[model samples]
Target: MSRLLEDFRNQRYPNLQLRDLANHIVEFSQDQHGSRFIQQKLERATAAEKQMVFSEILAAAYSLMTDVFGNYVIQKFFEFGTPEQKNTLGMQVKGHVLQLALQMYGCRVIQKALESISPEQQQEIVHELDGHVLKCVKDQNGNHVVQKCIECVDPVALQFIINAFKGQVYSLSTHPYGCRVIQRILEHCTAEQTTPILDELHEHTEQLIQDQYGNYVIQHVLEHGKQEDKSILINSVRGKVLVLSQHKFASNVVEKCVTHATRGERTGLIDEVCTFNDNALHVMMKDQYANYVVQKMIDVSEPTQLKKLMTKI
Candidate 1:
């Protein structure tokens, strides 16, 4: 064991072989005294050596960290590691290990690490962790791990995460992660910053509507949007319904809107439009079509309108 540690200290082991030293530590750490020795080595190792040690130890210890040092040490690992190291460790660890990290460390430490990561690294981590989290969620048996990953996620990654689960968010109840994401999006994409993304969401929503997932899209809009924006969204859908009521494709658009509005509890907006004089409603609705016009509203509205709308409700 000393020879292995010495080899690790001397950098005698190739990068690929360094992992074996970590495995040895894991083997020794199974016993109380061995674990203590490993901890002492960790403390005494230089930063570069520590990095190698952690890389190897992370792979070997994996889910067993919870069993050995418990959550406290796990939390320290996340809190004390440099941003690059944390991210690298995060990537090296599996979902189960990550779930343990979140459980031991809580959201605050994870949030801090996420914030500390460079923007470029943040994107990479988001993509990798997003995939892992989604897999955990979809797999059912992995739900607890999924929840942990969700808690650990940063606000910047919220948009991508929410958008990834856009059509399915309703099935999950009001996830705090989802709420946090929506809140950040609303705050950052102020009226001035909302147009581009709103337009993108609009187009994406239209595709969803066409795919018969309008109800899902509306649910997302409501979840992420403010009250006034929700109203605007419903009204926009209603206007599309009214306008397309005469076209060959009107029925499809109307059906999608009615399903979404009713299911999403946007009935009041639909009722308000129903109160309009029939001719005025008809004229406003015209051949404009709901999906097309809705897209247009999203496109032409001031970024502020969208931002304000998202925040108002």
Candidate 2:
């Protein structure tokens, strides 16, 4: 794409007024320098000046809303536009929320509008993403929009998200963006909202620990979940400490389980390694990832346990 026309490229628009761009507002808005110029003025522009720019861009709003350079100008308007202007822009965004949520530049505009618009408007925008929750959660651009919704929208309004992910927790837990989306819910959603999700996570805790992406979700719960939940994860890790500690991914969870496990639990983890078959310690101490688990045990174990480990070493 041609970035700038002759004058747009050569001419310096350092002090140009919003009114000055008149007929070429859309062209200027789409240009790198012009987009920044418009963005800077929107925050402090007079209503007439803002209206001038708004009218020029409104005709091409959809195009600009998804343009790399132009999207920011639209985002700026969402932040600074009059209530009516924001409402109108939001309406323009209504039908396209799903597509925009999945588009590269368009996703950002949707996210910005969610933050800049009213709660009712926010609900209206996110509602479009309803049936496509999983698709959005797994999308590169779309996942961010889903995450923002979890953070900015009411959990009640977003209950659809939890519902969409209900039976798919283990699968989503092992996805790149899906893992992230699940974490966002765990961090923001209420117990009533997160319980089913956690139950699914617990059901697959053993597998999630070994998954490349799933390990993150398990670690999240270990780091932040309630004691009851943590105990479950810790229990799952108990007898398998030696085996899991040697795993490429599950080894990370083993470290967390060791650190987060209670004193008695921590001791159990250390004792298993220290007293497991003679070669268990040798094998763990020599394996690349398991070595870290061994170190973690040394770091968190009690003095007596440490002395026992010292003897075992």
Candidate 3:
């Protein structure tokens, strides 16, 4: 085993031998005794020593790690590995690998690592990372990593990040990190730069709304849009052109709309819903959409609840 480790450490194997090593680790990892031995070796080795062996072991064990150990080990190595290791590991792990890593480490570790990276590195890494990771990391917690990464690393990543959480604006509205990231990116980016990101997000958001909210968004747009805009909105909704119309909001835009509607600003309330389709409305309403909307109206309008206004109407 020691000789095997040394040869691997020295990278002395022929191509055929290297292939054998790869196959060997897969078999070894599955064997209880063999796995225990590897784990013991990992424990005894210093970080530097372990890292050296890990690189080779990683190559040999890549299939095993992915198949058996799953993403946890892959993520740990990526998160804590040295720059060179990370770069190499980055190439080895693709697709859902980075996303799983980001998820496993959580926002805190990912945020710090992203912040630590230089702008040039950020640009490079973001370019390399899969789009799925870009999207998944747009959630409130995911946004933290994204914001820090964008702030210190690549601004382009923000484009992807914005694309990820585009229609989730309200969900992100209250999240200081998410809002700040969007605001900052928008502040620095040109309309040309922002346009593409927005366009992609718009498309994604629209798909999300359709899948999740269906025709509810169309109803809101028809109910609220200005004559011309409403006509356009209605056509777009019907034609499936305004993709984000059905996208779920990040929060309760319905409540906001209800508040505005009850305050004698029905146009604005309607307009607000028309702007995005209130995807988060369903979530906020949960098991009681009608009740939730009514309660929200009462809370916002005081003595003039929705139920009372509807009765009068």
Candidate 4:
């Protein structure tokens, strides 16, 4: 019923029970500093101590999951508490995964909790999300949580999860939030998992390469995708390097293409971009986004192309 007595001279209690503090914490976790004071204790508290406090918090988990300061307390409980504690919290969220994943504060807690549980529990919690994968991936806050699941889920489950996004890869890649889901699919899932997604994306690569968000997905593919996937992805922008270089956002992606391409590919891309826009190449050299792409070409240019490019400049 007292605080830990580490500083003997200060006279703290050695036999403190967190239940003794839980009642006061409910009120304390509402304020700016009070939440800070409570979270450290939650993080460092002994298993017994954490449960004592969590018992008071479990019923109110959803409520605190939405609170500004209170959410941090709920987050810590998921981070450091017992399995029983985590599940008690997970149980409250088991069926309501979508609603939780969609909110700002609530989404953070959902992500924290999903990664805290077992594969079975993770599967159960995430299975409710099966039917709505794309919808969740399209939400700003929700995308993050879904991405976390993609990073943490087991293979068989992941296959099903990936299946849920079937035929949506192209559309998903261009979305502000959905684009990230595609990137996460690449970063965390297996090449096999990404193959179909890329197959879907292959047909829409040029359009995706120009999207503000979609551009990142294409670049990630170029960097990490399997050879065949990269081949197709790169070919999508094949003769259009000049067009991509002039694009507002795709220019960045174009620069990556140059950086990753083989010497032969680089020369081929450079030859295309440079010759297509003789006068425009010089203007593009000074244009904001285009200049960066051209500069990259210069960085990797062969002696002949470098001199030729400068002569044009």
Best by lDDT: 2
lDDT of 2 at 50: 89
Per-residue CA lDDT of model 2 for 92-152, tens digit only, reads 8887887888889888888888888888988988888878899889999999999888888
TM-score of each prediction:
0.37, 0.93, 0.42, 0.84
lDDT of each: 0.45, 0.85, 0.43, 0.74
lDDT for position 215 in model 2: 96
Residue-level lDDT tens digits of model 1 in 11-74: 5654423235454645544445444544554544567656765565567544435454422333
lDDT per residue as tens, model 4, 71-173? 8888888788778778878887776677778888888887888888766788887778877787788897888888888877765577766786788887888
Candidate 2: which pairs clash? none
Evaluated against the true structure, the overall lDDT of model 4 is: 0.74
- The residue pairs found clashing in candidate 3 are 171-250, 206-243, 206-244, 209-246, 209-247, 248-279, 249-279, 249-280
Best by TM-score: 2
Error of 4 at 7 (Å): 24
lDDT of 3 by residue, 1-313 (tens): 4555456446564332222333354344444444544444444445655465456556653454444343334444444566776655544433233543445333443443344434455565555544554344445455555555556654554566556555564444334444455544554555456554344333444332333332233233334433443333333333221223223441233433344332345433333333332332443233343335435444564333433443211
- Superposition error at 226 for model 2 (Å): 1.6
Q: For candidate 4, report its TM-score.
A: 0.84
**Backbone clashes per model, in order?**
7, 0, 8, 1
- Candidate 2 structure, TM-score to reference: 0.93
